[PDB]
């Protein structure tokens, strides 16, 4: 246990929130059960007291030695000083619920006997369970599995509370008095949980209620079960839609492109090339267009995620050793990513030159049909459109993509736009172009 816990990178703090969640789940799952069922017998009462003391000691350790150690951000910078952390926890709205949970209402154990309705204030510490839910849902890589498991747990908990309320109604009317109430022949929690399932899922088939309390109970339970079943439908639909949102949007765009290409009667080879492009884009990037994601980010994180991805590819070019950092940064923020199918033409001979190609995880060939040099990933081609303004010079070789090349395009207008602002970079680039010529 250190002086200050960071509460983002601490799996020890996540395990402590797991222990407070297990204490809170013990209290929520076993206060109505011990309150209603006769499972708090004179033999097992020492085990219930042992686990209740373990749960209250976990609550008190949370209130005294972990929650006053939380590193929190105030005024931009983080706070490490321990008395300021203690003051921030004492002036919080977590502490009112924690001190509202930890009052010894178990001093009424000697006044009105043993009753687990006096421990019902321990069900006020829901904020530690929700903090554990957010922490596990934000450290897991597949959060839809935990959201499905948590909705299943909420459904089983509502059925557990309904089984406890049904056994209370059975013991209030009299066990075995009418035909609606619990008869009392098998496992009491199992038959009451079966009644809770068959009522709150609105299945029916149970005996019909006889007197007015039973009709009111069955009415309110079926009415709340309609809304629980509707909320379960909506929550499973929500986790289905949030789990496959990217793949469903990609499949929708691929289906719209296929529907357009079949509406306008586009030939088989062009339709196969578009479908092969879509298949390789999903198998490579797992997204449709990465600029649609990247242009929602701020400029400095766009610059960081551009420099960390593309700087080894740019600096491994031996022609870019004399350039400057700001021009390379504006380059990396103005590099557009394309993709070329095998056998495609990136630079046809004699055409107008307008793009600078940084090949990134591909393999292209230069050409007639004879190969001269097979350019691997990281290399460059397109230095003849570095100098030409307007028409100027043309492409001097047929450049073809051997594999699924993923070029990085730099337009000639943007390259000349940044180059006329940095004449030192223009000088070294024109001298390397001159020794190429």
């Amino acid at each position: 246990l250190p002086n200050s816990i960071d509460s983002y990178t601490d799996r020890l703090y996540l395990l402590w929130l797991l222990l407070v969640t297990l204490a809170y789940n013990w209290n929520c799952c076993f206060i109505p059960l011990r309150l209603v069922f006769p499972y708090q017998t004179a033999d097992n009462i020492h085990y219930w007291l042992i686990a209740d003391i373990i749960c209250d000691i976990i609550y008190l350790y949370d209130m005294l030695f972990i929650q006053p150690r939380l590193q929190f951000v105030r005024g931009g910078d983080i706070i490490v000083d321990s008395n300021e952390l203690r003051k921030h926890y004492r002036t919080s709205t977590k502490f009112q619920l924690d001190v509202a949970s930890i009052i010894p209402f178990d001093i009424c154990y000697l006044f009105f006997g043993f009753n687990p309705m006096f421990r019902a204030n321990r069900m006020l510490k829901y904020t530690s369970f929700f903090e554990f839910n957010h922490h596990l849902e934000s450290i897991m890589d597949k959060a839809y599995i935990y959201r499905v498991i948590r909705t299943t747990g909420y459904l089983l908990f509502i059925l557990h509370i309904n089984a406890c309320v049904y056994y209370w109604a059975s013991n209030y009317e009299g066990i075995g008095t009418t035909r609606w109430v619990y008869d009392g022949e098998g496992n009491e929690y199992l038959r009451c949980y079966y009644w809770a399932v068959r009522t709150l899922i609105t299945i029916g088939g149970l005996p019909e209620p006889q007197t007015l309390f039973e009709i009111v109970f069955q009415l309110l339970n079926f009415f709340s079960g309609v809304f629980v079943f509707s909320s379960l439908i909506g929550q499973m639909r929500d986790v289905i839609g949030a789990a496959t949102a990217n793949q469903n949007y990609f499949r929708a765009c691929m289906d719209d492109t296929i529907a357009y290409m079949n509406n306008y009667s586009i030939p088989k080879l062009v339709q196969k090339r578009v479908r092969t492009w879509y298949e390789y884009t999903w198998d490579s990037q797992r997204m449709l267009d990465e600029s649609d994601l990247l242009k929602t980010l701020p400029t400095t994180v766009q610059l960081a995620l551009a420099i960390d991805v593309n700087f080894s590819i740019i600096s491994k070019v031996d022609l870019f050793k004399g350039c400057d950092t700001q021009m390379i940064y504006d380059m990396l923020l103005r590099l557009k990513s394309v993709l070329y199918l095998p056998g495609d033409f990136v630079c046809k001979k004699g055409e107008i030159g307008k793009e600078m190609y940084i090949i990134k995880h591909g393999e292209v060939q230069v050409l007639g049909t004879k190969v001269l040099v097979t350019l691997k990933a990281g290399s460059v081609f397109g230095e003849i459109s570095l100098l030409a303004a307007g028409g100027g010079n043309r492409r001097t070789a047929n450049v073809v993509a051997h594999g699924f090349a993923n070029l990085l395009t730099l337009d000639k207008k943007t390259l000349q736009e940044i180059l006329v602002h940095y004449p030192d970079s223009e000088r070294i680039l024109m001298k390397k172009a001159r020794v190429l010529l």
Partner: protein
């Protein structure tokens, strides 16, 4: 005399005070019409509540006779013009039909049949107007949508329960297995037993659970299939409305988690470094925790331009008055400046501007903590704080010294600073013809190059 205002709060309190007896009239008019012992036993209570509901209906006709409207932006206060505009509508016909004195017939039958008072349900527009005003007025719109949907299906289930008891009274009590049992038996003859069992029947039918006794005659078969189709459309409405407000109740958290999972999928596909990935994810978690995730222009785009200007004044002028250079500047340029600022948030260790770069932005610090450092890492010469400004000399392009016009300082953020990003072009366009920024920022560039 006095004219109420349909945007005020006296009108909303009258919408509450008139959406009470409309709801009473719907509920207890169908129940008193169909049950016939609830009407006979509590007759003084229903005469008292009928007097109160018709007094409130007369006062609602009087208030709709004096509710102003908007023509040419001004609320009309001429009572004859308000009365004429009210009398040339259909709501006046609905209120006049909803106050037809059929209580003469209600007395002629003998105050036992409230079927002649069924025209009092014609003021449903006040109930719908109150639910619309509370839906756009209250702070909990999803909790109010649950309250309104539960209220609507409780109206429907109650009306169906009274309809089933009326059909059972028309067929005959206790003749078949489907109808309500024999009301001379003392177990089934209590009024609470009648209403609670009919409500149980109608919930079991209209929610398509079906544990009720099956029909015998053809009228019962037809009523049960009509009731089951109404119930399957009601169950579809319940499921769709609850799923729609589950998608509404966490739409912001859903798109936030979608943005985090999209950027995390991009960072795990490109396989960037773990410190950069943790920096971006902690950046997004800080923007979630500090309630600043949706951009300011995208929030205030539904507002008009002068309301955006007043919001920008009342948010950013308390920060922009803590500066030392815009004291000798005009209030109009202060308003235009807070219209121009776009607030961005940086991370600890993030460089704002490196040394030897060119400037295209100016930053105004607002609840942050920065430090101008050397090239060796962190070496805090001046620790900047709230209210101050930096990044200012390399956008004016003033002449006369050896530094020219490039970023001559390395500046990092110590904590999660929240700067005010001000570009070169929008500042120099907002204060092109007005020389205050030129002279004051030339003085500030003069003292920066005096430090040079």
């Amino acid at each position: 005399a006095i004219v109420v205002d349909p945007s005020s709060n006296l009108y909303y309190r009258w919408l509450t005070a008139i959406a009470l007896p409309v709801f009473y009239n719907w509920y207890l008019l169908i129940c008193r019409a169909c049950f016939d012992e609830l009407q006979s036993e509590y007759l003084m209570l229903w005469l008292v509540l009928d007097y109160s509901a018709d007094v409130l209906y007369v006062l609602d006709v009087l208030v709709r006779a004096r509710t102003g409207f908007l023509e040419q932006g001004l609320m009309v206060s001429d009572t004859n013009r308000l009365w004429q505009h009210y009398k040339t509508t259909t709501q006046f016909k609905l209120d006049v039909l909803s106050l037809v004195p059929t209580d003469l017939a209600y007395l002629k039958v003998g105050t036992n049949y409230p079927e002649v008072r069924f025209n009092r349900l014609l003021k449903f527009s006040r109930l719908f107007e109150f639910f619309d005003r509370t839906e756009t007025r209250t702070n909990y719109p999803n909790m109010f949508r649950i309250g309104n949907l539960v209220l609507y299906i409780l109206i429907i289930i109650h009306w169906n329960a009274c309809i089933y008891f009326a059909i059972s009274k028309f067929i005959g009590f206790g003749t078949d297995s489907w109808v309500y049992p024999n009301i001379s038996i003392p177990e089934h003859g209590r009024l609470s037993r009648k209403y609670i069992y009919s409500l149980y029947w109608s919930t079991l039918t209209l929610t398509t659970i079906g544990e009720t006794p099956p029909p015998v005659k053809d009228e019962e078969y037809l009523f049960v299939v009509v009731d089951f189709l109404v119930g399957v459309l009601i169950f579809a409405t319940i499921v769709g409305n609850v799923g729609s407000m589950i998608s509404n109740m966490n739409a912001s958290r859903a798109e936030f988690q979608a943005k985090i999972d999209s950027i995390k999928q991009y960072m795990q596909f490109r396989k960037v470094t773990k410190d950069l990935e943790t920096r971006v994810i902690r950046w997004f978690d800080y923007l979630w925790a500090n309630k600043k995730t949706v951009d300011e222009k995208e929030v205030l785009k539904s507002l008009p331009d002068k309301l955006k200007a007043e919001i920008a004044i009342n948010v950013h002028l308390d920060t922009l008055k803590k500066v030392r250079i815009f004291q000798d500047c005009e209030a109009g340029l202060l308003v235009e400046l807070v219209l121009k600022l776009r607030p961005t948030v940086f991370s600890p260790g993030d460089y704002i501007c490196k040394k030897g770069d060119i400037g295209k932005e100016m930053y105004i610090i607002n609840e942050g903590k920065l430090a101008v450092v050397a090239d060796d890492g962190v070496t805090q010469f001046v620790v900047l704080s709230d209210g101050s400004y930096f990044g200012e000399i390399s956008i004016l392009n003033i002449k006369g010294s050896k530094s020219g016009n490039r970023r001559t300082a390395n500046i990092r953020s110590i904590g999660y600073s929240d700067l005010f990003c001000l570009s070169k072009d929008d500042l120099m366009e907002a204060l092109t013809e007005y020389p205050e920024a030129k002279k004051a920022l030339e003085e500030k560039g003069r003292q920066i190059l005096m430090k040079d």
